[PDB]
Amino acid sequence: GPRARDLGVPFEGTPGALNAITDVAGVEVGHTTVISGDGAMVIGKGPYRTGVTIIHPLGKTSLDGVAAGRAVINGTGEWTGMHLVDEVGQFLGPIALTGTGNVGLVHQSMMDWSVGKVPEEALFSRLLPVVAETLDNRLNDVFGHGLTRDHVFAALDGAKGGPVAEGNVGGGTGMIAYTFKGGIGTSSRVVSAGDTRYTVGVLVQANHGDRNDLRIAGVQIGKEIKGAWPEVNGIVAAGPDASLLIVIATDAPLMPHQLERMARRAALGVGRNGSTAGALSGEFALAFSTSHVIPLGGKPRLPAIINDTDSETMNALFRGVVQATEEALVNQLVASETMTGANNAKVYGIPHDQLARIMKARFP
Amino acid sequence: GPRARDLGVPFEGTPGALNAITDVAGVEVGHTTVISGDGAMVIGKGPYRTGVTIIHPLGKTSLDGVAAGRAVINGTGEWTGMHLVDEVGQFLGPIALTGTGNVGLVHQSMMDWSVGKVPEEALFSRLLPVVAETLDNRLNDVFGHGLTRDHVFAALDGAKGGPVAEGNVGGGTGMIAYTFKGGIGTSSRVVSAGDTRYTVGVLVQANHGDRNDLRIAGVQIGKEIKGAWPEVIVAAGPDAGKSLLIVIATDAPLMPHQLERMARRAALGVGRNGSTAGALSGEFALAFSTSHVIPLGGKPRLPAIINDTDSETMNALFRGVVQATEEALVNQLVASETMTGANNAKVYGIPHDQLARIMKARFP
Amino acid sequence: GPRARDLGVPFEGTPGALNAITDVAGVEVGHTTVISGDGAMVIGKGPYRTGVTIIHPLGKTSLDGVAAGRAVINGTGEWTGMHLVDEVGQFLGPIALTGTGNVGLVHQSMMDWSVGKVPEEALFSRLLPVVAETLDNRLNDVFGHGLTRDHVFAALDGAKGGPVAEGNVGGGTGMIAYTFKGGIGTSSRVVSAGDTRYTVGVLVQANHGDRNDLRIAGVQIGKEIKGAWPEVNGIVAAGPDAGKSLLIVIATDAPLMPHQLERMARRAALGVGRNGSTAGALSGEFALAFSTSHVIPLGGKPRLPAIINDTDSETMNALFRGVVQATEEALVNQLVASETMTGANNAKVYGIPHDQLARIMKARFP
Amino acid sequence: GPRARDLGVPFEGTPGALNAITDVAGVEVGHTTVISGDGAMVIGKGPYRTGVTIIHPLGKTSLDGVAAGRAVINGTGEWTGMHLVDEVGQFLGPIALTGTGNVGLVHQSMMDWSVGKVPEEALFSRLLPVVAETLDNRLNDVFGHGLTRDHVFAALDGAKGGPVAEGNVGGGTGMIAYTFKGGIGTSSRVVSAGDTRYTVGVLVQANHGDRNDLRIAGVQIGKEIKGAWPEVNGIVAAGPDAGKPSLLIVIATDAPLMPHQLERMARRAALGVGRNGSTAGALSGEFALAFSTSHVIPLGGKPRLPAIINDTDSETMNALFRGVVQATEEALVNQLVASETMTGANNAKVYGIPHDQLARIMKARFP
Ligand SMILES: CC1(C)S[C@@H]([C@H](NC(=O)[C@H](N)c2ccccc2)C(=O)O)N[C@H]1C(=O)O
Ligand SMILES: CC1(C)S[C@@H]([C@H](NC(=O)[C@H](N)c2ccccc2)C(=O)O)N[C@H]1C(=O)O
Ligand SMILES: CC1(C)S[C@@H]([C@H](NC(=O)[C@H](N)c2ccccc2)C(=O)O)N[C@H]1C(=O)O
Ligand SMILES: CC1(C)S[C@@H]([C@H](NC(=O)[C@H](N)c2ccccc2)C(=O)O)N[C@H]1C(=O)O
Ligand SMILES: CC1(C)S[C@@H]([C@H](NC(=O)[C@H](N)c2ccccc2)C(=O)O)N[C@H]1C(=O)O
Ligand SMILES: CC1(C)S[C@@H]([C@H](NC(=O)[C@H](N)c2ccccc2)C(=O)O)N[C@H]1C(=O)O
């Protein structure tokens, strides 16, 4: 299927080979997507439109930590393991992105996953799993235990490198963004820092924004698109006729405080596309380095060291985050298809035909 | 049983009637304590020495939020709901304190508890439960699913005002503090601001510190006590070989940024008692107001307002936090009895007879 | 002179009457602008292109505090009084925006200004003045003591409500933004929160960004403009043919608590993001938000006329969108107000060309 | 004169040779102390009891930055250069500690000082000087311009290693702590992490706390001391007979720590403060800054990090943490003992903690 560039959307910069977070070597991504039932919602009985996305920073068999730093745009949401990141500048184990109702289940499942796989001696290092959420309340039976431990195990064990599936998959399955269908999006940039070229990879779970504010390549496109407003049982539920999780990977050998700076750049990329951070929109960014690794109980490994005042190197990386974030948000929208879920709520994927026509007229 | 004051330990300030967090009107506390099995530990089979402690800021039937603010001494640990507190200055629902292995189970159980008790329209407000941990790894089968949803429901439903049980109960059941038995401790202060009086209440789950650093009423006491070292064969002390959660309640009508100030005073009380915050010791404080309340979807209720630069009022409140924290820590030690747990690990409660003898000699 | 709207640049939302931070009642703004000397720079002898901008949140005669909260985009810069804002959620006295070399002189001059004007009893409240900077190093003799205490007194005493002068004035005098002339910019929004309408006002001192990244009304405009690259002694100093920090102040009359004003300040980054910049490593980019209705009388009881729920999306989102939109427009207003300037060492920086900008906007938004 | 240990106060741990922040090699400290005038205060005329203390992390000739991190106990005060530290984990130039009224003068004087000493190319790196304050309002003419640019130059240029003067000197000159005379104090700890040894050095400018809360070596000593309450306008101004006739903490270490790790060190200062009993007043600006002298960043160059430490290495980190706590605790008591009785503006009088009584109490408590 076409991604944003394939529909004529222009972006600045140079993407990695895959144009995805897996352009950062060693990163693995997995999804479990849970879609079942239709019609009226009864708590405990669906319909279900949910799932979980797993990102292994160093691959599924790693017991080591990665240097990490975070940022908050608006903190109305959950992201576990973050006190640890703020304190010691690293986290162990995978990142899980999921629906709000699933957080506790995913948290305990990740602990269970370690039993038998991890030397008893290292088990305590597996006790602060990283799990984050956005709310799939319009399309999904949030409280109804739709996600199982097996679902989580499958995503953990199935994760891999290579091309990353986008759209209505994993944690993004039942999400809604800019009043269109939400979901998973990803992008990357290769950035020239003098004689060295680093990779910055971004993955988003998007559940934020209003259509009236949306900009794609700077075009305020909500009013240019006709129809495609959400419905219920065949009635227009929004418009004139009636949260966001950002994961940043890089192979640059950054220290934790430097990774906080990377994470703070995500907001600028979000700003480019028009949203204004709603009061209850939990918008967060987490950045990690795959070259600055911390062997369990060992000496941190830092292959090179970068000066924070080295503008040539840092600006290249910063611009990478902003561009990759901007593009990941548009890739998400393009990858997400129309879906009908709980209570016959219907949310449209941004129309490909209309988008391509608008881009062609604006950028001949 | 005797508490610290009853063994002759002197403290500064004026305690409330119960000398406990429930001296703040409307606050309720419940514990479920899980103690079963003996001998060699097999993961999934126990022995179990764990549990959960619940604090309802406004009582178990409240759907409203309380104003809140937090502080971190050392962030190697988990406390959920804290991004929410940082962002909007309030949290909904109860505080749960538990062992590290139980966090996800407790988180999902709190969601389940709300189903059928809370109106469907208000269920989304129950999706960011507040759950915090310390690790009971020496005495408890941490990964072994010893805590059940029924255990969590019992603490939620059984919580009440009045005197609070301390020692080897609820979340503190399997904990270790200052190389003695750890657990739950609580204390309160009634403070004067001119003609106005307020209550500051403190509950701790203590799992921190080293015997050689411990001070009680300023006395470096670890070297004065004879024996009582842990056995794993003595595992510490001269004969070897032969985290902290602080919850602060107040009826003072404080704004969120003011409650952050209250939370930051906890460290000073901790410091009085000698510990130095170990590298992996997750030490956190959370403060809330029972008079600044936010009805769900309604107008915040702030009955009076306090100036941050009003030293007479603020200092009284700050000193309250420091003193109640100091005493809560000592009350914990005195309430906790000797316990044998997983793998026959044995941890002694600080000896009452020696403690009272030392205090009598120091404070004739 | 024309502002951004007058050149055909479209923006979303409804501005207040003045389209300026002074749309928030009681706010006063003053500038002192220092421009002297030409040619080669000698430290201590200019040329000088610097100054100071004063914002009195409740007017120049107020001794009271305003509720306040801040945010950092990239903290490579100075903004004094901010530990106080983080701790107790208010600040006393005026905000001063200036050049980096002037910070200490301004800080002490603000103390001196209080002597004789403030009851001795209240003097201690004047000891944590609020002073922020961006660096005018290309056009100005930074270390050369060009700004005097009299300059600072003049801005403090001359500040007033009504229309606010923009461009190469006050703290903005010698600044450079998006490789064009930088300076002061301002805008406002009146926002509907149910049955009440609040005002959000923004003033910026802009010294940030690159021409290649710049977006105006979403148009990547750097490559559309012909010429106007900076020069030295007649030599192009940037762009393809070479060789031939940001301070944001947000005022609102919404009765917000300090933690809520932190939320307002965190919205500024989103409006900056709309215009394309990516926050350079040494670009000190900061925002400070205050409420003129939540006031704290010195040694008295705080005055909070009404109270707002953080989870009330209708009210909070209106305010947040106000910050984003006013920030975006303030930044474009700055560029349009700022004229071409030659300063220290014959460094020449062009104001964004009005004729070209208007032609591009007409072509994009018929 | 005597330091705390000399009066029989016991402390835990092993101090460095100097028992001072300068036990960290290469650190230099300088003071300018301004004491002039007597009697009634007139703004602009004194009397003056103020000054400035300078700490060069890598010595007065260094153009390089040091890795750094900070912590706030109560942020009602000023400390410039701290947004920089929070953002990029380092600061350039010296630390200045001074009285509140002097902040702007010191800030500009530090810029002036660089002109002529620093290559024009590197001048921009001198534009975010680090300056912090506590308020000497009871003893000093705060607004009266008692501190001059020459005073600041003298401290910058006169700074050195070796023993550090304590008490009523430099920025601490006019200060008040625990209702006794405040001022400068310093202490150090040499800590063991396996076979490796590191030094943690602490310097304080103390202007905080109440006598009723003070603990020395765990002993609540305010009520045990007889007399020595302050006097203003001739009458006792505090204590049972009243009516009748902020804290700056600087931590240096030679351990090669990253910026986030130095934030952890700075957050340990609160525990050492807690040991001595204060509860952080509403308007008491209490701050800590920690820096590494081995993790250095050459101007416009590659950072130099000679070794690297795991945050989860308890043996190493706990040794360093305990060092901060113990050295902070001792530096606070060393201050009190070093500071002598002073009469200042308006004939306000504040007593140094009495040495004879303190020694007697320690002897009785610790036979
Ligand atoms: C249901 C709402 C009121 S909450 C908001 C939702 N926020 C989140 O998902 C937060 N992580 C979160 C906030 C509070 C509780 C649990 C999760 C979103 O991003 O969609 N959407 C609103 C709404 O649709 O009206
Ligand atoms: C056993 C404790 C309760 S005591 C404490 C520690 N003892 C040791 O570290 C001993 N080397 C040791 C001996 C046998 C097994 C494990 C460690 C001490 O000295 O303070 N650590 C606790 C614990 O391990 O849970
Ligand atoms: C097992 C240890 C290495 S972790 C530490 C323990 N920290 C916590 O409980 C933290 N919340 C936490 C930190 C990391 C993972 C999970 C929980 C404590 O306070 O007892 N004690 C050590 C040890 O005994 O040697
Ligand atoms: C001179 C520079 C290296 S610093 C940067 C400048 N940063 C600031 O003004 C900061 N507040 C600041 C940072 C460090 C010291 C003093 C002020 C800017 O925004 O223009 N521009 C660069 C440059 O022109 O190459
Ligand atoms: C005079 C101090 C050093 S003592 C301390 C305070 N005393 C009082 O506040 C007295 N009511 C007072 C008497 C005369 C003038 C001002 C206050 C106390 O009890 O500890 N405040 C200090 C100070 O103000 O500088
Ligand atoms: C004069 C006071 C009201 S302010 C306080 C003083 N605070 C500071 O020095 C702060 N850095 C500061 C706070 C506010 C403005 C300027 C400095 C202290 O530590 O002694 N003592 C009080 C008082 O004596 O009553």
Side-chain angles (χ1 to χ4, degrees), chain D residues 9 13 17 37 56 75 103 107-108 122 124 198 214 232 234 258 260 286 307 334 356 359:
Chain D
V9 188
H56 298 284
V103 169
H107 200 272
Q108 186 167 40
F124 84 92
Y198 292 120
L214 176 61
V232 337
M258 292 175 266
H260 73 282
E286 306 186 13
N334 278 341
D356 58 357

PDB file of all heavy atoms in Angstrom, chain D residues 9 13 17 37 56 75 103 107-108 122 124 198 214 232 234 258 260 286 307 334 356 359:
ATOM      1  N   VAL D   9      32.687  17.680  68.372  1.00  0.00           N
ATOM      2  CA  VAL D   9      31.594  17.178  67.539  1.00  0.00           C
ATOM      3  C   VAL D   9      32.039  15.963  66.716  1.00  0.00           C
ATOM      4  O   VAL D   9      32.991  16.041  65.933  1.00  0.00           O
ATOM      5  CB  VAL D   9      31.035  18.242  66.572  1.00  0.00           C
ATOM      6  CG1 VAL D   9      29.766  17.692  65.897  1.00  0.00           C
ATOM      7  CG2 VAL D   9      30.717  19.539  67.316  1.00  0.00           C
ATOM      8  N   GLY D  13      32.431   8.889  58.638  1.00  0.00           N
ATOM      9  CA  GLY D  13      33.181   8.919  57.392  1.00  0.00           C
ATOM     10  C   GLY D  13      34.605   9.423  57.541  1.00  0.00           C
ATOM     11  O   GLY D  13      35.043   9.753  58.640  1.00  0.00           O
ATOM     12  N   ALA D  17      42.305  15.555  53.384  1.00  0.00           N
ATOM     13  CA  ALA D  17      43.432  16.156  54.096  1.00  0.00           C
ATOM     14  C   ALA D  17      43.104  17.540  54.641  1.00  0.00           C
ATOM     15  O   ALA D  17      43.432  17.861  55.787  1.00  0.00           O
ATOM     16  CB  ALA D  17      44.640  16.242  53.177  1.00  0.00           C
ATOM     17  N   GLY D  37      31.557  50.678  58.345  1.00  0.00           N
ATOM     18  CA  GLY D  37      30.467  51.445  58.922  1.00  0.00           C
ATOM     19  C   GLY D  37      29.882  50.803  60.170  1.00  0.00           C
ATOM     20  O   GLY D  37      30.045  49.603  60.404  1.00  0.00           O
ATOM     21  N   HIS D  56      36.395  28.505  41.338  1.00  0.00           N
ATOM     22  CA  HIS D  56      36.785  28.098  39.990  1.00  0.00           C
ATOM     23  C   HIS D  56      36.874  26.574  39.959  1.00  0.00           C
ATOM     24  O   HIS D  56      37.770  25.999  40.580  1.00  0.00           O
ATOM     25  CB  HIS D  56      38.172  28.654  39.613  1.00  0.00           C
ATOM     26  CG  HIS D  56      38.258  30.148  39.574  1.00  0.00           C
ATOM     27  ND1 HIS D  56      37.740  30.902  38.540  1.00  0.00           N
ATOM     28  CD2 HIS D  56      38.860  31.028  40.413  1.00  0.00           C
ATOM     29  CE1 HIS D  56      37.996  32.180  38.758  1.00  0.00           C
ATOM     30  NE2 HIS D  56      38.678  32.283  39.884  1.00  0.00           N
ATOM     31  N   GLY D  75      12.876  26.823  46.018  1.00  0.00           N
ATOM     32  CA  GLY D  75      13.462  27.692  45.003  1.00  0.00           C
ATOM     33  C   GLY D  75      13.182  29.194  45.095  1.00  0.00           C
ATOM     34  O   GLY D  75      13.232  29.901  44.080  1.00  0.00           O
ATOM     35  N   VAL D 103      23.671  40.702  43.019  1.00  0.00           N
ATOM     36  CA  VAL D 103      23.631  39.730  41.917  1.00  0.00           C
ATOM     37  C   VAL D 103      23.963  40.330  40.548  1.00  0.00           C
ATOM     38  O   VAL D 103      24.835  39.812  39.833  1.00  0.00           O
ATOM     39  CB  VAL D 103      22.286  38.953  41.867  1.00  0.00           C
ATOM     40  CG1 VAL D 103      22.164  38.165  40.568  1.00  0.00           C
ATOM     41  CG2 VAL D 103      22.179  38.013  43.061  1.00  0.00           C
ATOM     42  N   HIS D 107      27.283  39.664  38.215  1.00  0.00           N
ATOM     43  CA  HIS D 107      27.020  39.109  36.886  1.00  0.00           C
ATOM     44  C   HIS D 107      27.749  39.907  35.786  1.00  0.00           C
ATOM     45  O   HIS D 107      28.494  39.331  34.970  1.00  0.00           O
ATOM     46  CB  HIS D 107      25.504  39.099  36.661  1.00  0.00           C
ATOM     47  CG  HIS D 107      25.031  38.164  35.588  1.00  0.00           C
ATOM     48  ND1 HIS D 107      24.946  38.533  34.261  1.00  0.00           N
ATOM     49  CD2 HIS D 107      24.554  36.894  35.658  1.00  0.00           C
ATOM     50  CE1 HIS D 107      24.459  37.523  33.557  1.00  0.00           C
ATOM     51  NE2 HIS D 107      24.217  36.518  34.379  1.00  0.00           N
ATOM     52  N   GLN D 108      27.558  41.229  35.764  1.00  0.00           N
ATOM     53  CA  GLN D 108      28.252  42.063  34.775  1.00  0.00           C
ATOM     54  C   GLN D 108      29.770  42.103  34.991  1.00  0.00           C
ATOM     55  O   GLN D 108      30.538  42.139  34.031  1.00  0.00           O
ATOM     56  CB  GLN D 108      27.668  43.494  34.710  1.00  0.00           C
ATOM     57  CG  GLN D 108      28.285  44.330  33.566  1.00  0.00           C
ATOM     58  CD  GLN D 108      27.530  45.620  33.263  1.00  0.00           C
ATOM     59  OE1 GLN D 108      27.075  46.311  34.170  1.00  0.00           O
ATOM     60  NE2 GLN D 108      27.374  45.934  31.974  1.00  0.00           N
ATOM     61  N   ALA D 122      36.283  33.317  21.832  1.00  0.00           N
ATOM     62  CA  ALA D 122      35.671  32.531  22.894  1.00  0.00           C
ATOM     63  C   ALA D 122      34.812  33.353  23.857  1.00  0.00           C
ATOM     64  O   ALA D 122      34.253  32.797  24.805  1.00  0.00           O
ATOM     65  CB  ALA D 122      36.742  31.781  23.669  1.00  0.00           C
ATOM     66  N   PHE D 124      31.862  34.649  23.701  1.00  0.00           N
ATOM     67  CA  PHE D 124      30.446  34.293  23.831  1.00  0.00           C
ATOM     68  C   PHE D 124      30.220  33.239  24.923  1.00  0.00           C
ATOM     69  O   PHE D 124      29.154  33.188  25.536  1.00  0.00           O
ATOM     70  CB  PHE D 124      29.865  33.814  22.494  1.00  0.00           C
ATOM     71  CG  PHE D 124      30.112  32.358  22.211  1.00  0.00           C
ATOM     72  CD1 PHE D 124      29.187  31.395  22.595  1.00  0.00           C
ATOM     73  CD2 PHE D 124      31.266  31.949  21.559  1.00  0.00           C
ATOM     74  CE1 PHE D 124      29.412  30.051  22.341  1.00  0.00           C
ATOM     75  CE2 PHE D 124      31.497  30.604  21.299  1.00  0.00           C
ATOM     76  CZ  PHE D 124      30.570  29.655  21.693  1.00  0.00           C
ATOM     77  N   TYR D 198      37.465   8.129  45.607  1.00  0.00           N
ATOM     78  CA  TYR D 198      37.057   9.415  45.058  1.00  0.00           C
ATOM     79  C   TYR D 198      36.906  10.400  46.201  1.00  0.00           C
ATOM     80  O   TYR D 198      36.736  10.006  47.353  1.00  0.00           O
ATOM     81  CB  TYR D 198      35.712   9.310  44.319  1.00  0.00           C
ATOM     82  CG  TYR D 198      35.755   8.490  43.052  1.00  0.00           C
ATOM     83  CD1 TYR D 198      34.967   7.348  42.908  1.00  0.00           C
ATOM     84  CD2 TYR D 198      36.561   8.870  41.989  1.00  0.00           C
ATOM     85  CE1 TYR D 198      35.004   6.595  41.737  1.00  0.00           C
ATOM     86  CE2 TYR D 198      36.602   8.130  40.823  1.00  0.00           C
ATOM     87  CZ  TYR D 198      35.826   6.994  40.705  1.00  0.00           C
ATOM     88  OH  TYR D 198      35.879   6.267  39.539  1.00  0.00           O
ATOM     89  N   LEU D 214      17.592  23.129  65.304  1.00  0.00           N
ATOM     90  CA  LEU D 214      18.988  22.710  65.087  1.00  0.00           C
ATOM     91  C   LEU D 214      19.385  21.400  65.794  1.00  0.00           C
ATOM     92  O   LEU D 214      19.161  21.236  66.997  1.00  0.00           O
ATOM     93  CB  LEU D 214      19.949  23.829  65.496  1.00  0.00           C
ATOM     94  CG  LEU D 214      21.460  23.575  65.453  1.00  0.00           C
ATOM     95  CD1 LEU D 214      21.940  23.235  64.038  1.00  0.00           C
ATOM     96  CD2 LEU D 214      22.182  24.818  65.969  1.00  0.00           C
ATOM     97  N   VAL D 232      18.056  43.236  68.452  1.00  0.00           N
ATOM     98  CA  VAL D 232      17.838  44.329  67.505  1.00  0.00           C
ATOM     99  C   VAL D 232      17.214  45.530  68.205  1.00  0.00           C
ATOM    100  O   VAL D 232      16.225  45.399  68.935  1.00  0.00           O
ATOM    101  CB  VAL D 232      17.012  43.915  66.245  1.00  0.00           C
ATOM    102  CG1 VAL D 232      17.105  42.414  65.995  1.00  0.00           C
ATOM    103  CG2 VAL D 232      15.565  44.364  66.354  1.00  0.00           C
ATOM    104  N   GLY D 234      18.676  47.008  70.610  1.00  0.00           N
ATOM    105  CA  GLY D 234      19.057  46.861  72.007  1.00  0.00           C
ATOM    106  C   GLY D 234      18.363  45.737  72.758  1.00  0.00           C
ATOM    107  O   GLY D 234      18.843  45.282  73.801  1.00  0.00           O
ATOM    108  N   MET D 258      28.404  11.609  34.687  1.00  0.00           N
ATOM    109  CA  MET D 258      27.644  12.293  33.644  1.00  0.00           C
ATOM    110  C   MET D 258      26.681  13.285  34.301  1.00  0.00           C
ATOM    111  O   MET D 258      26.430  13.202  35.508  1.00  0.00           O
ATOM    112  CB  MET D 258      26.873  11.281  32.790  1.00  0.00           C
ATOM    113  CG  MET D 258      27.796  10.401  31.949  1.00  0.00           C
ATOM    114  SD  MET D 258      26.901   9.123  31.049  1.00  0.00           S
ATOM    115  CE  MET D 258      27.041   7.736  32.178  1.00  0.00           C
ATOM    116  N   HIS D 260      23.387  13.744  34.373  1.00  0.00           N
ATOM    117  CA  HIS D 260      22.224  13.227  35.101  1.00  0.00           C
ATOM    118  C   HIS D 260      22.651  12.582  36.426  1.00  0.00           C
ATOM    119  O   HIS D 260      21.880  12.534  37.380  1.00  0.00           O
ATOM    120  CB  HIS D 260      21.418  12.240  34.248  1.00  0.00           C
ATOM    121  CG  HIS D 260      22.080  10.906  34.071  1.00  0.00           C
ATOM    122  ND1 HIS D 260      23.110  10.700  33.179  1.00  0.00           N
ATOM    123  CD2 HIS D 260      21.853   9.710  34.667  1.00  0.00           C
ATOM    124  CE1 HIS D 260      23.502   9.440  33.244  1.00  0.00           C
ATOM    125  NE2 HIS D 260      22.753   8.818  34.138  1.00  0.00           N
ATOM    126  N   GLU D 286      16.831  27.415  49.053  1.00  0.00           N
ATOM    127  CA  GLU D 286      17.796  26.352  49.333  1.00  0.00           C
ATOM    128  C   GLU D 286      18.052  25.511  48.072  1.00  0.00           C
ATOM    129  O   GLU D 286      17.139  24.851  47.557  1.00  0.00           O
ATOM    130  CB  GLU D 286      17.300  25.500  50.516  1.00  0.00           C
ATOM    131  CG  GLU D 286      16.987  26.379  51.757  1.00  0.00           C
ATOM    132  CD  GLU D 286      16.620  25.601  53.030  1.00  0.00           C
ATOM    133  OE1 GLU D 286      16.815  24.364  53.094  1.00  0.00           O
ATOM    134  OE2 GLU D 286      16.141  26.252  53.990  1.00  0.00           O
ATOM    135  N   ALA D 307      36.637   7.647  32.606  1.00  0.00           N
ATOM    136  CA  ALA D 307      36.073   6.374  33.007  1.00  0.00           C
ATOM    137  C   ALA D 307      34.584   6.619  33.100  1.00  0.00           C
ATOM    138  O   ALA D 307      34.137   7.763  33.054  1.00  0.00           O
ATOM    139  CB  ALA D 307      36.624   5.941  34.355  1.00  0.00           C
ATOM    140  N   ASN D 334      30.568  23.116  60.618  1.00  0.00           N
ATOM    141  CA  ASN D 334      31.799  23.897  60.474  1.00  0.00           C
ATOM    142  C   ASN D 334      31.505  25.378  60.266  1.00  0.00           C
ATOM    143  O   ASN D 334      32.205  26.234  60.804  1.00  0.00           O
ATOM    144  CB  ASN D 334      32.684  23.385  59.332  1.00  0.00           C
ATOM    145  CG  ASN D 334      33.537  22.197  59.736  1.00  0.00           C
ATOM    146  OD1 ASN D 334      33.765  21.940  60.927  1.00  0.00           O
ATOM    147  ND2 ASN D 334      34.018  21.462  58.741  1.00  0.00           N
ATOM    148  N   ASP D 356      32.404  27.315  74.115  1.00  0.00           N
ATOM    149  CA  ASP D 356      32.495  26.672  75.422  1.00  0.00           C
ATOM    150  C   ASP D 356      31.289  25.777  75.713  1.00  0.00           C
ATOM    151  O   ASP D 356      31.448  24.625  76.124  1.00  0.00           O
ATOM    152  CB  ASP D 356      32.752  27.693  76.554  1.00  0.00           C
ATOM    153  CG  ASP D 356      31.677  28.800  76.651  1.00  0.00           C
ATOM    154  OD1 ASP D 356      30.730  28.858  75.832  1.00  0.00           O
ATOM    155  OD2 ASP D 356      31.797  29.639  77.573  1.00  0.00           O
ATOM    156  N   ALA D 359      31.162  22.668  73.321  1.00  0.00           N
ATOM    157  CA  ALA D 359      32.148  21.663  73.705  1.00  0.00           C
ATOM    158  C   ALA D 359      31.687  20.882  74.938  1.00  0.00           C
ATOM    159  O   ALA D 359      31.883  19.670  75.025  1.00  0.00           O
ATOM    160  CB  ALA D 359      33.509  22.309  73.946  1.00  0.00           C
TER     161      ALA D 359
END
